[PDB]
Design a protein around this ligand. Sequence first.
Ligand SMILES: O=C(CCNC(=O)N1CCCN(C(=O)c2cccc(Cl)c2)CC1)N1CCc2sccc2C1
Length: 121
Amino acid sequence: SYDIQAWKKQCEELLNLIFQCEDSEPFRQPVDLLEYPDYRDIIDTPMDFATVRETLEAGNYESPMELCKDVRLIFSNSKAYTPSKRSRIYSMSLRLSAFFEEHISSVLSDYKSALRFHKRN
Ligand SMILES: O=C(CCNC(=O)N1CCCN(C(=O)c2cccc(Cl)c2)CC1)N1CCc2sccc2C1
């Protein structure tokens, strides 16, 4: 399967599944600064799933590795902001991360294989 472009629709599909997951609800839009006025004293680069989907749809990802970096930032921000490893929002982030990683692995492998095939000669 050597289609260099196939990752984009595969990532759209996976974002749709993430938006159906109840565990994504805290991460679908930017963290609420009124509720969390100290957020930007901890978190240098906010990220959320609506921003990832918009970046993808705008044609502003060149590879699925770039999308994966932004999704992993959603999860590292949650871990950095949590007051406890037992907190609800952080606990939802860990389940959603496991789901994401289980599904993105084939997207990344297929893309990287397609690029190697493109450069074979
Ligand atoms: O629930 C908490 C945690 C304390 N409260 C907090 O510091 N936060 C709660 C609000 C969410 N939050 C965000 O800013 C955030 C981060 C990512 C995404 C989004 Cl959407 C929002 C983090 C800040 N516990 C105290 C009471 C008890 S008693 C037994 C266990 C506990 C644990």
